[PDB]
Design an enzyme around this catalytic site. Sequence first.
Site, PDB file in Angstrom:
ATOM      1  N   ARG B  14       0.816  -1.212   0.000  1.00  0.00           N
ATOM      2  CA  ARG B  14       0.000   0.000   0.000  1.00  0.00           C
ATOM      3  C   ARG B  14       0.856   1.271   0.000  1.00  0.00           C
ATOM      4  O   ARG B  14       0.343   2.378  -0.126  1.00  0.00           O
ATOM      5  CB  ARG B  14      -0.992  -0.029   1.164  1.00  0.00           C
ATOM      6  CG  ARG B  14      -2.173  -0.975   0.923  1.00  0.00           C
ATOM      7  CD  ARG B  14      -2.872  -1.373   2.216  1.00  0.00           C
ATOM      8  NE  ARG B  14      -3.349  -0.218   2.972  1.00  0.00           N
ATOM      9  CZ  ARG B  14      -3.611  -0.227   4.277  1.00  0.00           C
ATOM     10  NH1 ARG B  14      -3.446  -1.333   4.994  1.00  0.00           N
ATOM     11  NH2 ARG B  14      -4.038   0.878   4.869  1.00  0.00           N
ATOM     12  N   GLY B 100       8.284  -3.286  13.252  1.00  0.00           N
ATOM     13  CA  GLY B 100       9.062  -2.097  12.966  1.00  0.00           C
ATOM     14  C   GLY B 100       8.286  -0.975  12.307  1.00  0.00           C
ATOM     15  O   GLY B 100       8.862   0.057  11.972  1.00  0.00           O
ATOM     16  N   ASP B 101       6.986  -1.170  12.117  1.00  0.00           N
ATOM     17  CA  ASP B 101       6.153  -0.161  11.477  1.00  0.00           C
ATOM     18  C   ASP B 101       5.278   0.603  12.460  1.00  0.00           C
ATOM     19  O   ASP B 101       4.214   1.108  12.096  1.00  0.00           O
ATOM     20  CB  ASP B 101       5.307  -0.790  10.359  1.00  0.00           C
ATOM     21  CG  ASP B 101       4.382  -1.908  10.855  1.00  0.00           C
ATOM     22  OD1 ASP B 101       4.486  -2.339  12.027  1.00  0.00           O
ATOM     23  OD2 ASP B 101       3.541  -2.360  10.050  1.00  0.00           O
ATOM     24  N   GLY B 138      -7.996  -6.683  15.844  1.00  0.00           N
ATOM     25  CA  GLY B 138      -8.433  -7.838  16.608  1.00  0.00           C
ATOM     26  C   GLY B 138      -8.849  -7.339  17.977  1.00  0.00           C
ATOM     27  O   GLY B 138      -8.172  -6.492  18.564  1.00  0.00           O
ATOM     28  N   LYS B 343      30.635  28.357  -1.540  1.00  0.00           N
ATOM     29  CA  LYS B 343      30.863  26.928  -1.755  1.00  0.00           C
ATOM     30  C   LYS B 343      32.298  26.498  -1.494  1.00  0.00           C
ATOM     31  O   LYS B 343      33.219  27.042  -2.096  1.00  0.00           O
ATOM     32  CB  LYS B 343      30.497  26.540  -3.186  1.00  0.00           C
ATOM     33  CG  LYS B 343      30.740  25.073  -3.492  1.00  0.00           C
ATOM     34  CD  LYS B 343      30.680  24.780  -4.981  1.00  0.00           C
ATOM     35  CE  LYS B 343      31.879  25.354  -5.716  1.00  0.00           C
ATOM     36  NZ  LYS B 343      31.806  25.061  -7.176  1.00  0.00           N
ATOM     37  N   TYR B 358      29.371  35.130  -5.791  1.00  0.00           N
ATOM     38  CA  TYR B 358      29.699  33.715  -5.775  1.00  0.00           C
ATOM     39  C   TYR B 358      31.144  33.533  -5.298  1.00  0.00           C
ATOM     40  O   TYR B 358      32.079  34.037  -5.926  1.00  0.00           O
ATOM     41  CB  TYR B 358      29.525  33.115  -7.166  1.00  0.00           C
ATOM     42  CG  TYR B 358      30.050  31.706  -7.302  1.00  0.00           C
ATOM     43  CD1 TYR B 358      29.787  30.741  -6.324  1.00  0.00           C
ATOM     44  CD2 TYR B 358      30.793  31.330  -8.418  1.00  0.00           C
ATOM     45  CE1 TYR B 358      30.244  29.435  -6.459  1.00  0.00           C
ATOM     46  CE2 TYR B 358      31.256  30.028  -8.562  1.00  0.00           C
ATOM     47  CZ  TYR B 358      30.977  29.087  -7.583  1.00  0.00           C
ATOM     48  OH  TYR B 358      31.402  27.791  -7.750  1.00  0.00           O
ATOM     49  N   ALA B 372      29.230  44.005  -4.350  1.00  0.00           N
ATOM     50  CA  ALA B 372      28.133  43.329  -5.038  1.00  0.00           C
ATOM     51  C   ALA B 372      28.532  42.887  -6.458  1.00  0.00           C
ATOM     52  O   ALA B 372      29.250  43.604  -7.164  1.00  0.00           O
ATOM     53  CB  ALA B 372      26.924  44.258  -5.097  1.00  0.00           C
ATOM     54  N   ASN B 378      36.637  29.056 -10.697  1.00  0.00           N
ATOM     55  CA  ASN B 378      37.551  27.964 -10.342  1.00  0.00           C
ATOM     56  C   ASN B 378      37.572  26.832 -11.369  1.00  0.00           C
ATOM     57  O   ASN B 378      38.551  26.087 -11.465  1.00  0.00           O
ATOM     58  CB  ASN B 378      37.239  27.410  -8.937  1.00  0.00           C
ATOM     59  CG  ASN B 378      35.828  26.816  -8.813  1.00  0.00           C
ATOM     60  OD1 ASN B 378      34.980  26.983  -9.690  1.00  0.00           O
ATOM     61  ND2 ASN B 378      35.576  26.131  -7.699  1.00  0.00           N
TER      62      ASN B 378
END
Lengths: 445, 445, 445
Positions: B14, B100-101, B138, B343, B358, B372, B378
């Site tokens: 499901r 486990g659920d 049940g 980065k 950047y 700015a 690179n």
Amino acid sequence: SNFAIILAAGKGTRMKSDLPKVLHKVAGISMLEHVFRSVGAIQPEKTVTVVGHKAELVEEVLAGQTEFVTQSEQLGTGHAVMMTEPILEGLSGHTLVIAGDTPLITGESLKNLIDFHINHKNVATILTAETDNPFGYGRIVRNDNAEVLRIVEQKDATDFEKQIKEINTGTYVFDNERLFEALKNIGEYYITDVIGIFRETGEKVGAYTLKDFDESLGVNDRVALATAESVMRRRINHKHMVNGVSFVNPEATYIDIDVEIASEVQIEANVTLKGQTKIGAETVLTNGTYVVDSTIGAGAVITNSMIEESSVADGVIVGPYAHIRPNSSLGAQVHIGNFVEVKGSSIGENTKAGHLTYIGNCEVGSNVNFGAGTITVNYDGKNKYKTVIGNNVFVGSNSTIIAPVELGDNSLVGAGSTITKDVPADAIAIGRGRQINKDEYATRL
Amino acid sequence: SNFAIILAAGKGTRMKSDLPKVLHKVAGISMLEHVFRSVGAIQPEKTVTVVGHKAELVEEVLAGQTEFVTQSEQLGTGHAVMMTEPILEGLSGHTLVIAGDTPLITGESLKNLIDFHINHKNVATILTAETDNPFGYGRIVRNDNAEVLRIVEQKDATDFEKQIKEINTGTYVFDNERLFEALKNIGEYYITDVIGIFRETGEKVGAYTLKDFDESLGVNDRVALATAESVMRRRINHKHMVNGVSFVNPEATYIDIDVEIASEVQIEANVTLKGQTKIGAETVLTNGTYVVDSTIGAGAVITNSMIEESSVADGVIVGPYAHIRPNSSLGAQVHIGNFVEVKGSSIGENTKAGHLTYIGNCEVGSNVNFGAGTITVNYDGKNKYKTVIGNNVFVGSNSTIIAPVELGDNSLVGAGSTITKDVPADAIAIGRGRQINKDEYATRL
Amino acid sequence: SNFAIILAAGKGTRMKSDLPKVLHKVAGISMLEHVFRSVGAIQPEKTVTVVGHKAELVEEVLAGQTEFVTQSEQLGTGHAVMMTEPILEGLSGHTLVIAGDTPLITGESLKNLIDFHINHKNVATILTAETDNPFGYGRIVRNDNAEVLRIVEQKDATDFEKQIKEINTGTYVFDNERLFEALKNIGEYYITDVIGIFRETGEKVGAYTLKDFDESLGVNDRVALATAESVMRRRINHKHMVNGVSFVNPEATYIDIDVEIASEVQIEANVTLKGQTKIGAETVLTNGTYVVDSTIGAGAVITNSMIEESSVADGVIVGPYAHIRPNSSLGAQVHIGNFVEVKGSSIGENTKAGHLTYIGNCEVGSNVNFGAGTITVNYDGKNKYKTVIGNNVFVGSNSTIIAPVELGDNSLVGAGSTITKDVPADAIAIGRGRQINKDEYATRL
């Protein structure tokens, strides 16, 4: 035989809007459209929609999918139903009367309303519902044998009647022939007064009770509009989750009624998908992504970006903070990074544009690399030009490409270059300034 | 002595996924992991985890922290428990059987389950719960003395039994020795059939009732996955609020299970904190901020920005719309403005980069100012180079810094300059074009 | 005659904050401010506010709108009320005692509290409320005639008393004269012990019951702070919806207490409006838009942008991902696109800046066009200069404008130009490099 009349003439003053109440949107389409969709569940032989305020606007919405009739002045639901006379009186069947301001009512519920009206051979069946706070609504009076006697509103309601929990939703199913004849008998006409006529003749009157009261919501103001938005939002997202789409927060994710999403698609909270949008299998959508009328292939990752009227192939990686404007295509495995805008341009497979770049009105080949800060110019204060960029072209960072120009295959644009003329294939184009160092000069600054 | 068996073999159809059901995530980690964590609350002498579908994937998750056993074909929970035989049969204690659920079940609840099983000397204790909509589950049948007789599902359920509100959660605690012996007695084996064996022998069977029914949720589809996400989300945010963290909307803020947040930290709605993320004291996080595996010092302000695998010292001001990519460090009081991307670079204290910039693969000193539009290059279509920027360097707006290059201390780069060679300390570098005005020329445009 | 005493001396340790508990904010203003606002509904002849911890901070908040009295050490609510003695004892009226940590209590409720105290000629009226989980609160003990006998907390509470649902909200209305005399009779003083004194004398004591229990919330930790935020958020958005404002999700939209919004304004989910913000009629605000202390005219569209301390005329189109920083003005029909920052600048009507642009400290005329990548420089590492841009100026893409400079009317700046000197009206300014193509050179790269 089943017939249908859609009421959509009220102005809706509590909305504080000039737009016809029924045209206000919920999850993409108008309330009126949601109503019309539930109607088709009973496959109406003929469908008539009563209009009034700004009839023009409304007619554009359901033009060609249903018949119309105009109501001059607001003379009540009775007069509204009488406008259906020229088209329905003289037909054998069951005519359902539904208002257009009840977007949540489902088709299955209307089927159930029609099946009940038939199974019990009623002359008039009322779609009712129970609530523990019936203030305002008309109450369904029955007897010791559970027979529906009459609807009594809060103007004729005695204290014993003021406690009845079963109320009238304002949606009915009447016997066509009898309906229009009884309308001639009855300062405004009420569709509810028709039940009074049936009572005098002792004609059979029943009531189908809606299981979910909230499904009966009638939008009169924006408070209720938001509630409809809430129920509809949950409904749509539920379906998607059953279809195999994961939602971090289905209560805070905004997906329009007609959006298509494949299985295994993962959607974070606060994602917006509007209009004719399609999402391919396994595609990941992060918080803030906003998509309008766009197709997105499989295995794509859209990180906090905005995509309007464009197509996105498989494997495309976008964002965060990227903007894909109208009429663009991103070939397979294309990478669009942060603060990059693509407008009216086609981008070939594997092309990369990872930073602060503007690509407008360009046809770009595959394997192209846009260095950070690349700007394409197409406007001059009057005209819009186009630029062609071949395959494997390396566009230097902080460069300016001035249309109309063509960069041939495997071309290279030196960083910081201002390009005004075509660059032949396999050639390199440079057009910047040389560096000059001045010792001990930064001492005087 | 306490033992434990974790059931994790079902596929979960499901879900409409090829991933093992238990591996689907909730607030950062898999459902299986949440289960395993609650288990350790009873300090299991030995822990066995039953696996099946894509056993490889699952084993990577809990490798080394629990024992495993594989189940060839899906032959029911009984067969699954029988796989624990080679490792558990022949030990005196209490063996807890949990699926486990069921991610929401807490350790305290399992402790309570073990303490009840002992206090009542039961041979089998069933973790049950009460709900006013028991359809599907049940039902626990008892008697006038409240003794647990048997579990009856909706296949053997009589009308009188179909009204019992107390249901079975699918979590039990059995007497180790008796459990595996009774399994040999019993088209699939059910762990529930074990209770039938105990009944025939009149062996003691009890039931610990969970106070919060919702804690018993069993995830079979994505609808329930989102509900687990909902409960877990609230749980985590509650703890943080008790720890002194303010939330504008704890119901719409997404913080992973292992995130650490100091007191006085202010968090607006729609903030996302994922993985191994830490937030220092008094730090402010605004709507839209998305942080993955990062450390953030105290007194920092992160305005609508994205920070991945990086470190952020104290006093750092970021955003809005900034992107701090993997392997970056922002020294104290560093300022990163709108539409700036950092980065794989280290940024010294007090350095400012407020706009459309950047900075990739750079080592930057303290007190540096990025004008700015500054772009660092690179990549050349093959190689990745590095650039060193000293302290107190003023980088001109709209400049392009081409690696490998070094800007010495107190250096200055003229605005719009394209830098290809090192700039000695205290020197100034310029490399642009001179301005030329042409009168009455804008008349012809 | 009506009098009022506002209790605001507690520190709030469960907050884990050094800030006075009552100063914590909810929808824009402190809890204390919300309380003070409800107070004025009974038009208090005199208002006294009891302070203690960091009295300085608190006094700045309500300075000049109410009288103050300091409490040395925390000696209970009784001692706190005794600080009002020098200013209130010797006056005929009704003195309302309200704590400052109950932000949700409305003015209408306090009016009702005063009207009840008068209508029933009570010597002490207690604002109570009913809940099905009274754990912790003091319970209102009455009799067979419904007369209020006494308040009993969970220290003197017998089992029969431990089931009373009617609790004490900690808000009262006492007869001024009697109040201060009874305080001299009573290890800390409790305002509740005053009711004991009235009982011994058989003096009339009543209780007004709050219809909405949740309105009685007392904030002791951040969990409750968020709940207050929740109720207040809903309250505010409800009002707006009644005023004709559409909300996609009123439960996830963040609008401060004093924000003003005209009718027909459409607001998507996740919009943030803070401080002294005003929204003109029909203006559209999309998901993510964040506005602080700004005015926005009618018919404007703000798509996922941030606007701080600025003014936005009618017809302005902004975003997505745009940043309008402090002290800026956007004339009518101005267009600010993605990744554009406007700081301390005035922008004339119809001016366009659609992409990756920074406009700082500029006076810009009407009909100006900023090409993508345009950068304005004002800072040199010490001084801040200004630039004047006339009407109908076309600023070339990727250009750098260095202040102080003036671009005369109808001027044109060539793309990629670095401008250091004034450009006369109708002139064109160019200052870049010429393009040089090198055949077969991209073969060696």
